[PDB]
A paper describes a structure:
The inner membrane export gate protein, SctV ([name] in SPI-1 and [name] in SPI-2), is the largest component of the injectisome and is essential for assembly and function of T3SS. SctV comprises a highly conserved N-terminal transmembrane (TM) domain and a less conserved C-terminal cytoplasmic domain (SctVC), which are connected via a ∼20–40 amino acid linker, SctVL, in most bacteria using the T3SS. It has been reported that SctV is one of the “engines” of T3SS; the TM domain forms a putative proton channel, and SctVC forms a nonameric ring connecting to SctN (ATPase) through SctO (the stalk protein) to function as the F0F1-ATPase, coupling energy from ATP hydrolysis and the proton-motive force to secrete unfolded bacterial effectors into the eukaryotic host. Consistent with other reported SctVC structures, the SsaVC monomer also has a four-subdomain (SD) structure and further assembles to a nonameric ring aligned to SD3, which is the most conserved region of SsaVC.
In this study, through generating a chimeric protein consisting of the TM region of [name] and the cytoplasmic region of [name], we produced the full-length SctV in a high-order oligomeric state which was adequate for structural study using cryo-EM single particle analysis. A homogeneous and oligomerized ISS protein was eventually obtained in buffer containing the detergent Glyco-diosgenin (GDN); however, [name] (similarly to [name]) could not form the stable nonamer in this condition. We reconstructed a high-resolution cryo-EM structure of SsaVC with an averaged resolution of 2.11 Å. Unlike SsaVC, for which we obtained high-resolution structural information, the EM density of InvATM is blurry, and the SsaVL EM density is absent, with an approximately constant distance between the cytoplasmic domain and TM domain; this is consistent with a recent study. Structural comparison between SsaVC and InvAC in a closed conformation or its counterpart in flagellum, FlhAC, in an open conformation shows that SsaVC in a full-length context presents a semi-open conformation. The diameter of the channel at the center of the SsaVC nonamer ranges from ∼54-41 Å from the cytosolic face to the TM face. Consistent with the observation above, B-factor analysis of the SsaVC structure also shows that SD3 is the most stable region of SsaVC with the more flexible SD2 and SD4 floating around it. In each SsaVC monomer, the hydrophobic pocket at the connection region between SD1 and SD3 is occupied by a hydrophobic peptide (M346-V347-P348-G349-A350) from the neighboring SsaVL, forming the hydrophobic interactions between two adjacent subunits. Using 3D classification with this map as the reference without a local mask, the linker region was classified into variable conformations, with two major orientations, featured as left and right linkers (bottom-left panel).
Residue numbers in the entry:
A (entry chain E), B (entry chain A), C (entry chain I): 346 to 681
Amino acid sequence: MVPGACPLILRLSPTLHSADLIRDIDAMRWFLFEDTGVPLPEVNIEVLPEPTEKLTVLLYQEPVFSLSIPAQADYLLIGADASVVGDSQTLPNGMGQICWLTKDMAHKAQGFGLDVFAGSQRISALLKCVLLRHMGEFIGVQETRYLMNAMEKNYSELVKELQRQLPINKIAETLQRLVSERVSIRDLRLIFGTLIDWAPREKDVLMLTEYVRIALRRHILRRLNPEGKPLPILRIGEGIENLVRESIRQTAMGTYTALSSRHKTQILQLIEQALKQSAKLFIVTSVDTRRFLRKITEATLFDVPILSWQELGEESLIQVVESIDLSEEELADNEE
Amino acid sequence: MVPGACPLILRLSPTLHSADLIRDIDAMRWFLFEDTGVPLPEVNIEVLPEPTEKLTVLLYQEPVFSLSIPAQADYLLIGADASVVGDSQTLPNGMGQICWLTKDMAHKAQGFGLDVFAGSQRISALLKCVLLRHMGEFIGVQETRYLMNAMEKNYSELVKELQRQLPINKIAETLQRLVSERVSIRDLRLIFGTLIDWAPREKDVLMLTEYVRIALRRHILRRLNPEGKPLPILRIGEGIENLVRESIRQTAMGTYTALSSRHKTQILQLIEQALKQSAKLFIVTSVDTRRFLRKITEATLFDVPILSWQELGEESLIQVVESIDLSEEELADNEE
Amino acid sequence: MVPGACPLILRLSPTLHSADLIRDIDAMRWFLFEDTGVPLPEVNIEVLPEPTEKLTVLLYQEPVFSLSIPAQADYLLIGADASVVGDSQTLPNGMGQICWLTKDMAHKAQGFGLDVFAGSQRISALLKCVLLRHMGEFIGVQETRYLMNAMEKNYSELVKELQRQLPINKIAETLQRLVSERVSIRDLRLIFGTLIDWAPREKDVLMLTEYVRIALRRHILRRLNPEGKPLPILRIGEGIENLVRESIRQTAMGTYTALSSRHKTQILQLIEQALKQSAKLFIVTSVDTRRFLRKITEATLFDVPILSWQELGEESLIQVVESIDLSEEELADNEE
């Protein structure tokens, strides 16, 4: 009886276990830390004797992932495309797609310019995927405390000033909000500086997160697209922007949105209908409506990034693909 | 004369005592801790010389369970079903049902896919049942203090921040309220984080418990149904919802419900009449009426879970079975 | 997993690496410190095995510079002019221009009175260029703390009085604002004295930065032109000055500018059109409009210096080249 659930459990059949799985998992953890700034806890491996090849991932002892690999599962390719086809299944909780390939098909797919995993790697490519879906569950008050203690080696004055400006709960909330939107918190020096700059003039954690996002726009654009090539952008029309802006209500803890269920459902439906034509799109809205749009779209569309006009500079061309726009619904259908 | 009643006493006849009873009881305690997050105290075994095979369970020296096993009691099956029939009695305080089976009938029931206990196990399966009915009696201020002290090994900052936000009596009240509704408090890290997040914006312990329940909805649904198969759902109609919502009165300590005895009795009667058609149903109501419905139904219907719409996500289909709805009674019978 | 991104990474192919690169880089860092007052962190050299000669510069692990040198790249000349022509490419993020020259052409260009780099020097001349574009990213609260601690050896009383007058966040903000406009902070004694003088009478960090700029006008003019020869000056007309002055709005944290997007775009367009006739021009405006003009022109025109009338004394002749002037746009086009 030890209070506190074990953070990370990976349960595997004895066949799936390998001698190099530990180092492979550690390398995946180091890659995730470098890519996101979130230091993950150690993965606890549990060998489960089972005739059927099954693997499960439990976060804090709650099963979040389960998958039975087929008997022919020897080469794995995350995602789907035209050049590769065969033995494709969709992972639960809308993580993405996985394809199982034979040796020659895996070789030709690797030659095509894709990553193919064999052996223990196939486990990591799965675990990493799951770990990428629940990153925000690994950054809280204690983890923020750990990051701040680590930052005191070279930035003792910065950490002291940040603590002078904000309590640890607000810092943890800001870091968690950043992590939940796939924004890396690797650059703690810049994030802490931005929080110090804006804390006296702003008490709302959501607005502080928006300011930090603006300060990190270089990294956000670098991660969204490695190259300067024009990636498609879907603009939110002025009708939706004003509809969501008029719903902003301010209380002592900051501003929230007060929109009807019909409105949110119709914007979500039209956005989803406007997302099926291409694999990836970036939704761009105004500065004062980006966070509210995200929080009314994060429940269903979690993997789509919501960008703000201030988050893209004037040195990047926009290549607008579509322009989604609607007016109110309850008062009058209007555009909807 | 030692002040403080002994928490857990199991009194057995010498025949029922076994050499492996201690380890069996300890395993049951470890299972209960893993399933509920509540660390139970040590069970004190008292051998009572009696010609009649009897066992009693006393919580804090008050007899809460008593049962005389028959002479043919050698295989025990908790619950009732169609495939198994014979020597069935109903446990007191509406715990459930117990069936005593012969060797061949126990073998066929085990083959049918049920759990059958023989020997000392039959005691534990009974004790565990009793322990599952009075879990909320083992989580108080001292037990909350113990859990927080245990959590300080890896989450010292989290515990310090929680103490900064809330006094120990409110934390204990929240934990007890969670335990009383069969919500596991195993994930203390998430519960403490939610309490830290919502404590500045909310002083009502019931509302804080509701927020923690919302944060734990993944585990709640996982426990209510292990699989994704559609389990039946009984919706509370809008008439009952508005009737109970109009009765909300707010004082300095928070909001309570002020409903007539006739109203509560009629809702309880109709809910019970709507529960007899199937073995298990999940009552689903609005967010602002879930706690009040629970506290007006917990006295009689303790084993039925009251869920809120926010507690089920949009990724689960609802399969509505019935729609209970009534208007007021005293002003006019209306639907009732 | 070490929290805190590595500040300075230079990634080179093994061919570009040299035995004297370390000392060359250190000399460049000492020159930059002497010229700007900003102590740079150590450059971390990473040798990347690649068939193509490529070099990248990453600030806090974010790639900010990338360039593939050609096979004939043996002599490098930063900038462009009439006497030198051949193999010229433009660096990204509008840093400037680079020209690759052959041995005899490099010799004749050096004789013409220009600096030509061969070997490891060609790397530094590139890195320095990049380091000159992002100097403001190396001066924050921790770096300000370091400079103040260094200043306590000979100016303990001055540092104590400055701390008595201002908190470290405001001092860091002032230093960063000075560095971002290519104003050296080498003379910390004078900057701290000015901040002590003006802190009781002024709480706005932007106004304090303006006062420090006024106190440092001797160095600013010395850096802008080494000689007393007449360098061209572009005056901002009274219409633009009054248009931007009427937009000044004051809140509890100081004064900001509230101008329409059309206004800012038209002033930027006319300034850019008025900058193409000559290689270098100095924009001169009023004292109360210099900072606002800079902050509405820094995003696009970062390398052009915005001067104030108080920043030039009466001992220097002005040699006005152009007089840009416009009225409002939205109310009426007027001059625009």
